[PDB]
Amino acid sequence: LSNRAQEFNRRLTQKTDNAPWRRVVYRRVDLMEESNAVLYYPPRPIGDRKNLFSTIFGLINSNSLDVYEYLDGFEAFTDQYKIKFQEFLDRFGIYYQPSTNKNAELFKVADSDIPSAEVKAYYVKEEWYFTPTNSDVDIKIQAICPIMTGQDEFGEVRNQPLFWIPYENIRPYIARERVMLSSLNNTRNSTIDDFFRLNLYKGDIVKTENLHNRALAEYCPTPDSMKMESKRIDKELQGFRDGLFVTQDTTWMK
Amino acid sequence: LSNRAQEFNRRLTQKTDNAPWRRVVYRRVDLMEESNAVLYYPPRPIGDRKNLFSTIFGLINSNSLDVYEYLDGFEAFTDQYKIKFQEFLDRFGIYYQPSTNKNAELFKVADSDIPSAEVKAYYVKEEWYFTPTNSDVDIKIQAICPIMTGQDEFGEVRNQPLFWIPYENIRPYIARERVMLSSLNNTRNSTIDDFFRLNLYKGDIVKTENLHNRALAEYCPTPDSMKMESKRIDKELQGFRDGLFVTQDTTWMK
Amino acid sequence: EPSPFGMIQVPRGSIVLGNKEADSLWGIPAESRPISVDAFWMDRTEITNAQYRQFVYYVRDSIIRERLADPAYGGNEEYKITENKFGEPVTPHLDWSKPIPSEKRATEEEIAAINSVYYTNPVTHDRKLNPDQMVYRYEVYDYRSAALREHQLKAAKRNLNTDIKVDPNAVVMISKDTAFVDESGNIISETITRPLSSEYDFLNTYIVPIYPDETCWVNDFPNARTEIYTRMYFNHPGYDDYPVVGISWEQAQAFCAWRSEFFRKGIRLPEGQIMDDFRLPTEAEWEYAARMGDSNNKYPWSTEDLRTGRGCFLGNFKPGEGDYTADGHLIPSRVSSFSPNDFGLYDMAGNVAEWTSTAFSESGLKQMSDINPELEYKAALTDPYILKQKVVRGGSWKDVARFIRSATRSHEYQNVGRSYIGFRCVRTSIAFSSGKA
Amino acid sequence: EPSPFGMIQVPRGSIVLGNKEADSLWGIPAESRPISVDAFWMDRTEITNAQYRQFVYYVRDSIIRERLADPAYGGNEEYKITENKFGEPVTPHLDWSKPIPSEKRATEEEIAAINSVYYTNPVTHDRKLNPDQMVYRYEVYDYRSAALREHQLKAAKRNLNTDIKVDPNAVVMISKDTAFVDESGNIISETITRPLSSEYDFLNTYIVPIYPDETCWVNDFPNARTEIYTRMYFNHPGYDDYPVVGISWEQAQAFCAWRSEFFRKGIRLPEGQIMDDFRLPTEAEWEYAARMGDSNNKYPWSTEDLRTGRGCFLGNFKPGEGDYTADGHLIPSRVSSFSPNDFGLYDMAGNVAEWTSTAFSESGLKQMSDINPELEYKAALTDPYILKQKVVRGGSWKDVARFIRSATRSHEYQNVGRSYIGFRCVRTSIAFSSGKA
C-alpha cells in the first residue's frame, strides 16, 4: 500500500521474459499429505483460520478480485475470457438472494455453502525458468485450481474444476494472512505467500505443456504408471539442474 | 516493413536459377513425431498459440494471401490456376453467412470449423540445390500441403489435399509468429520460419520429381517398401553430399 | 594499505547458506540455497561499550558545541565566518579546532549550555546524558536506487526498449525519509512521496536518538532483578571490553555512519576518492563469515560439537535448561573470551545476536540474488509494523544451542533494542587478489 | 610490418562451427555446418577499463576543445584559419597542437567551458564526466552495400542481363542513418529513405553517447548489493587491467571506429593506402579464433574438461550452482589471469561475454556464406526491437559451464549494455602467407 512497499514489491517480482528455459509443468498436490494440509480449515472466516478456497470465495464475492475460468484441456488467459459468478453458482445450484449492500457484495456467503471441506487436492501451474542474469533455476507461480474432488457412489474423484486463479491477482490478498504452517510447531510466523514462494506444495506432476497437449492419462491406466511418469518428470528436471554441476571429484581421498 | 528490413530480406533470399543441381523431392512428415508436432495447437487464435493451418486459414479468409490449389499428381503454379474459397468451403459443406465487414473478410471463422485437430501429416516440396558461387548444398522450400488425414471406418488416411501454399507468399506472415519449438525447453525463442529454414521437418520421402512422374505407391504395397524406398532416397542424397569429400584418411595412426 | 585496526579481511567464497535436514520437533522447512559472496572487512569483536561510548562522547561534544555556539546560550561564535584566512566565506556549520570546554571553571552561560543536554535526577541527584537529547543527525545516499533504470533522471532513459514511445509526463513515485528538527525540539521524522524531479529525491537524512536503551535489561526480563545491569552496564568503567546491548537498528545504522564519517575525516587520502564506507553486515555476508564458507560447518568452529576435547564450552550461549553459566558466563561475556575461529572473528556464534541489514521476509534466501545478496527495505512511518522487521543472526547468551547454529534466521523489530542484540560495522574491501588457487 | 601491439595474428583455417550432439534436457536442435575463415588480428585481452578510459579521455579532450573554441565559451579561436603557413585555407574543424588546457590556473571562460561538460553532484559534491554529454561522432562507409549490383550508380549497370531493357526511372530505395545534432543539444538520430541519387547515400554518420552504463551493475541484479561495483568499477585506478562492462553495441562500434581513427592518425604511412581498419569480430570469426579451428575443441583449451590435472579451473565462469568464486574470482577477473590457449587469446571463453557484429536471427549459421561469413543489419529507428538483436558469444562469469562452451549462441539487444558484456576490436590482416603446409 505504501510507496516503499510498492517499490519493494516491484523489485521483488521475477522478470522472466527472456530466459533460455521456460518449462511450464502442471502438478496435482494432495492435501492428505502433511505438507499441503494447510488447506483443510473451516470455511467460515472466524477471524483468520481460513483455507485458500474460503478467502478466494470471499474476495470474488465482493468483486474485489479478477479471475479467469477453466477450458477443459487448454488454459487461455484472456480479458474477454472472464469467469462469471452466475456460472459459479449454477455449478451446484446455489441460490442468489441478493444483498442490500450492493457495492460491498451481491451475494451473501451462505456459511458452509462453499465446498471447502470436500476439496482434497490442488492443481498448480509452475514455470521452471532459467535466468539471463544470475543463472539460477527458479519457479514462478501463475495459476491454480481448487479441483472439486466430489465423492460419488463408486468413490471416483469426479472433478469439476471451478475456475483458474491467477497468482498475480490473489497475491495482494494472500501476503497479509499468515496462518500456521507445520503442525509440530503451530506458530503463526509464515504467510501463505511464503508457502507458495518457498515451493512446499510437494505433489505429483499430472502433465506438462507438451507439444501433443496430452496428459498422463493417455499412458497405462494403472496408477503406478502415473507414479512412474511423475517421478520420471521429477528426475528429468533434477537432471536438468544437475547438468550445470562442474564440481565433481571433490572427495580428495586416496 | 522497413526499408532496411526489405533490403536484408532481399539479401537473404536464395537466388537459385543457375545451379548444376535442382533435385526437387516431396516429403510426408508425421506430426506424431516429436520433431514435427509443433502443428497440434488449438484452432482458435487465443493470442498466439496457433498451428500452421489456423494462421493460413485466417490469412486466406481475409484475402490478404495469394495461394494455389492441388492437381492430383501434378503441381502447376499458374496465376490463372488460383484456388477458390468456394471450392474450399464446399469440400466439407461449410456455411457462408457473409459478414458485414466485407473488406476485412467475407467469411467468419466458425471456431472449430477448421480441421486443425484432425490433420496429422504434412506434405512438403523441398528443392535440394547446389550453388554456383559457394558450392554448398542447400534447400529451398516452395510448397506444402495440410493433407486432410480423415478417419473413416477402416482407419484409412482418406486424404483430400485442400490446396498448395507457396512458401514465398506465407513467409511474411510466418516470420513474426514465434511459437515454442521443443517440449523439453518450452521457450518462445524460434519462429516457425526458423523451423522451416533449419530443416527440422524430419519425415519420409513420398516421391521425387521423376521422369515417369510416379510415386512410391507403384512399388510393393507393403509399408516396408515405403520405408526402404524413403531410406534409399535419403542415403542417395547423403551419398551425393559425400561425393564432394576430399578429406579421407585423417586418422594419422600407425 | 588502509587496513583498519580491529578488522579482519574475510576473502571471497561460497556457502550453502542454510541447513538441509530439518528438525522435525521444531517443525521448520529448513530451506537452503547456495550463495557466493565477495571479500570484505569485518570487525573481529562485537562493538563494545567502549566504542559506542566514544560515539556518544563525540555526539555530546558537538551537541554542547552547537548549544554554546547559539548566541542565546553563550554566544562564543567560534564557527568559521567569512574571510577565513585566504578570504574564504565557508559555511559555518561547527568549529572543532576551538579550545575544549573546561569543567569547573567557565562562565555561567557556558555552564548552562553544557548542562542543557545533561540530566540530573530530582530524587537521586545523579547527572548523566539525556536519552532524548543524545540525537545523531546524518545523511545517506541511496546509490542503489539512484542508478535503477526506472529511477533515471531523463524519462527517455527509463526504457531502452524503443518499441514503446516514452511519455514525458511519466508518473513515477519516489520515497525519501528525512527527519527534520522543529523549533519546539520535538524531532519529527517524515516521509515524502513527491514525484521524481531532481537528484535530491535520492538522499535520506536521518536524525535519531542514539543513547542505548538500558531499560531493555528490565522490559524483556520480568520477575527477575537486573538492577546491577541496567544501572551501569554502559556506565561502569570496567565494562569496557564487553559488547554493547540495547542498540536499536536505527542506532546501529547511525553508529556505522558515524564510523564512516570518522574514517573519512581522519587519514586524509585523496587517492581513496569514492572508497567504500561502513555499514551493517548482510545476512548472507554474516553467515558466510560465520561458517568459514564451509558446508559442513554447522557452527563457527572446526568440530561439529559444542564441547572441546576437554569438555570446555565455546561461546557463552545457554548450554543447558536454566544453565546460563554452564559455559562460565551468565550475561554477555567480554569479547575474545573464547577461542576464535581461524577466520579471525571472535565470538562468532554466541555472546550477543547480531544486527544485520537485510529485512526479514520469511522468503529471504529464496528471494535474493546470488552475488552479495541482501534485501533493502527502508520502511518509513505509515507502514505496518510487521514490515519493519530487520533480521538478526548469531544466537545470544539466552538462546539454546539450536539458535547458536549460524544457519538460523530470527525475527527482530528495527525499532526495539533488546539486551541480547549486539551488532557489527562491516566494510567492503576493494582487494585485487590474484587468486591462483 | 605494422603488427599492432596487443594483437595476435590468427591464421586462416576452417571450423565445424557448432556442436553435433544436442542436450536433450536443454531441448535445442544444435544445428551446425562447416565454415572457413581467413586470417586476422585479434586482441589477446578483452578491452579493459584502461583502453576505454583512454577513449573517453580523448573524447572529453576534444569536447572541451570544441567548447572552448566556441566564441561564447572562451573564444580562444586556435583552430586553423586561412593562410595556414604556405597560404592554405584549410577547414578549421579542431586544433590539437594547441597547448593543453591547464587545471587550477585559467581564465573564467576557460573554466566555464571545461565545466560545461563536467557534472557535479548536488547532494554528494562529486564531479565526473556527464554520461549524456560524452558523445562520440564518427562516420562509416557502407563499402559492401555500395558495391552491390542493384546499388550501382548507373541504372544501366544495375542489370547485366541484356534481355530486359533497363528503365532509367528505376525505383530503388536506399537506407542511411546519420544522427545530426540540433541547436537544443538533444542529439536526434534519424533514418532517410531518399531514392539513390549520389554516393552520399552510402555513408552513415553516427553520434552516440559512449560513457559506459555503470547502472548495469544494479538494473540486471535485483535484491543484491553492488554499491562497490557500479560506483567505481570504471573510476578505480586499480581497476585498470579488468575488462570493461556495460558497453552498448553502438558504443562498441564507436570505440572500434575510434581505434581505427587513432591507428590512421598515428604512424604516418602512405603505403597503407586503403589498409583495413578495426571492427567488431564476426560470429564465425570469433568462434574460429576460440576453438582453435578444431572440431574436437568444445572449449578453448586443449583438454575437454574444465579442470586441469591438479583440479584448477580455467576461465572465471560460474563453476557450480551459486558457486561463482569456485574458480577463484567472482566479478569479471583481470585479463590474462588464466592460462591462455596456444592461439594467443586470453580469457577466450570466460570473464565477459563478447559483442559480435553479426545480427542474431536464429537462422544464423544456415543463412550466411562460407567465406568470412557475417550478417549485417544496421537497423534504424522505426524497426521492431526484436530485429535490433546483435548476437553475443563467449560465456560470462554469471553463466554456467553450458554457456561457456564456445558453440553457444545467445541473444543480446544492441541498445542495452549489461554487466557481463565485454567486446573486442579485431582487424583484417592482409598477409601473404606462403602456405606450403
Ligand SMILES: *C1O[C@H](CO)[C@@H](O[C@@H]2O[C@@H](C)[C@H](O)[C@@H](O)[C@H]2O)[C@H](O)[C@@H]1O[C@H]1O[C@H](C(=O)O)[C@@H](O[C@@H]2O[C@H](CO)[C@@H](O[C@H]3O[C@@H](C)[C@@H](O[C@@H]4O[C@H](CO)[C@H](O)[C@H](O[C@@H]5O[C@H](CO)[C@H](O)[C@H](O)[C@H]5NC(C)=O)[C@H]4NC(C)=O)[C@@H](O)[C@@H]3O)[C@H](O)[C@H]2O)[C@H](O)[C@H]1O
Ligand atoms: C528532509 O526534508 C525536509 C523537508 O524537505 C528538510 O527539512 C526542512 O529543512 C530543515 C532544515 C528545516 O527544519 C525546515 O525548513 C524543514 O522543512 C530536511 O532538511 C531534509 O531535507 C533533505 O531533503 C530535502 C528534500 O529533497 O526534500 C532537501 O531539499 C532540497 O534542497 C536543495 C538545496 O536547497 C534544493 O535544490 C535547489 O532546487 C531548486 C528548485 C532551487 O530553486 C530555484 O529554482 C530557480 C529556477 O531554476 C532558480 O533558477 C534556481 O534553480 C536552481 O539553482 C541551483 C543553483 O545551485 C541548482 O543548482 C540548479 O541550478 C537549479 N535547480 C534546478 C531546478 O535544476 C533555484 N534558486 C535558488 C533558491 O537557489 C532551490 O530550491 C535549490 O537551490 C532541492 O530542490 C530540495 O529538494 C534537503 O537539502 C535535504 O537536507
Ligand SMILES: *C1O[C@H](CO)[C@@H](O[C@@H]2O[C@@H](C)[C@H](O)[C@@H](O)[C@H]2O)[C@H](O)[C@@H]1O[C@H]1O[C@H](C(=O)O)[C@@H](O[C@@H]2O[C@H](CO)[C@@H](O[C@H]3O[C@@H](C)[C@@H](O[C@@H]4O[C@H](CO)[C@H](O)[C@H](O[C@@H]5O[C@H](CO)[C@H](O)[C@H](O)[C@H]5NC(C)=O)[C@H]4NC(C)=O)[C@@H](O)[C@@H]3O)[C@H](O)[C@H]2O)[C@H](O)[C@H]1O
Ligand atoms: C546525416 O544527415 C543529416 C541530414 O542530411 C545531416 O544533418 C544536417 O547537417 C547537420 C550538420 C546540421 O545539424 C543540419 O544541417 C542537418 O540537417 C548530417 O550532417 C548527416 O549528413 C551526412 O549525410 C548527408 C546525406 O547525404 O544525407 C550528407 O549530405 C550530403 O552533403 C554533400 C555535401 O554538402 C552533398 O553534395 C553536393 O550535392 C549537390 C546537389 C550540391 O548541390 C549543387 O548542385 C548544383 C547543380 O549540380 C551545383 O552545380 C553543384 O553541384 C555539385 O557540385 C559539387 C562540387 O563539389 C559536387 O561535387 C558535384 O559537382 C555536384 N553534385 C552533383 C549533383 O553531381 C552543387 N552546388 C554546391 C552547393 O556545391 C550540394 O548539395 C553538395 O555540394 C549531398 O547532396 C548531401 O546529401 C552529409 O554530408 C553527411 O555528413
Ligand SMILES: *[C@H]1O[C@H](CO)[C@@H](O[C@@H]2O[C@@H](C)[C@H](O)[C@@H](O)[C@H]2O)[C@H](O)[C@@H]1O[C@H]1O[C@H](C(=O)O)[C@@H](O[C@@H]2O[C@H](CO)[C@@H](O[C@H]3O[C@@H](C)[C@@H](O[C@@H]4O[C@H](CO)[C@H](O)[C@H](O[C@@H]5O[C@H](CO)[C@H](O)[C@H](O)[C@H]5NC(C)=O)[C@H]4NC(C)=O)[C@@H](O)[C@@H]3O)[C@H](O)[C@H]2O)[C@H](O)[C@H]1O
Ligand atoms: C554534532 O553532532 C550532533 C549529532 O549529529 C549534531 O546535533 C544536531 O544539530 C543540532 C543543532 C541539534 O540541536 C541536534 O538535535 C542535532 O540535530 C551537531 O549539530 C553536530 O553536528 C553538526 O556539525 C558537524 C560539525 O561541523 O562538526 C557536522 O559534521 C561536519 O559536516 C561537514 C559538512 O556538513 C563536513 O565537511 C565535509 O563537507 C565539506 C564542507 C568539507 O569542508 C570544507 O569545505 C570547504 C568548502 O566549503 C572546502 O572546499 C573543503 O572541502 C573540500 O572539497 C574537496 C573538493 O574540492 C573535497 O571533495 C572535500 O569535500 C573537501 N576536502 C577536504 C578533505 O577538506 C573543506 N575544507 C575546509 C575549509 O574545512 C569537508 O571538510 C567535508 O567533506 C565535516 O566533515 C563534518 O564533520 C554535522 O553534519 C552537523 O550535523
Ligand SMILES: *[C@H]1O[C@H](CO)[C@@H](O[C@@H]2O[C@@H](C)[C@H](O)[C@@H](O)[C@H]2O)[C@H](O)[C@@H]1O[C@H]1O[C@H](C(=O)O)[C@@H](O[C@@H]2O[C@H](CO)[C@@H](O[C@H]3O[C@@H](C)[C@@H](O[C@@H]4O[C@H](CO)[C@H](O)[C@H](O[C@@H]5O[C@H](CO)[C@H](O)[C@H](O)[C@H]5NC(C)=O)[C@H]4NC(C)=O)[C@@H](O)[C@@H]3O)[C@H](O)[C@H]2O)[C@H](O)[C@H]1O
Ligand atoms: C572531438 O570528438 C568529439 C566526439 O566525436 C566531437 O564532439 C562532437 O562535436 C561537438 C561540436 C559536439 O558538441 C558534440 O556533441 C559532438 O557532436 C568534437 O567536436 C571533436 O571531434 C571533432 O574534431 C575532430 C578534430 O579535428 O580533432 C575531428 O577529427 C578529425 O577530423 C578530420 C576531418 O574531419 C580528420 O582529418 C582527416 O581528413 C583531412 C581533413 C586531412 O586533414 C588535412 O587535410 C588537408 C586538406 O584539407 C590536407 O590536404 C591534408 O589532407 C591529406 O590529404 C591526402 C591526399 O592528398 C591524404 O589522403 C590525407 O587525406 C591527408 N594526409 C595526411 C596524412 O595529412 C591534411 N593535413 C593537414 C593540413 O592537416 C587528414 O588529416 C585526415 O585524413 C582528422 O584526422 C580527425 O582527427 C572530428 O571529426 C570532429 O567531430
Ligand SMILES: *[C@H]1O[C@H](CO)[C@@H](O)[C@H](O)[C@@H]1O
Ligand atoms: C523427528 O520428528 C519426526 C516427526 O516430526 C519423527 O519421525 C521423529 O520424532 C523424528 O526424530
Ligand SMILES: *[C@H]1O[C@H](CO)[C@@H](O)[C@H](O)[C@@H]1O
Ligand atoms: C537426454 O534427454 C532425453 C530426452 O530429451 C532422454 O533420452 C535422456 O534424458 C537423455 O539423457
Ligand SMILES: [Ca+2]
Ligand atoms: Ca553463557
Ligand SMILES: [Ca+2]
Ligand atoms: Ca568465476
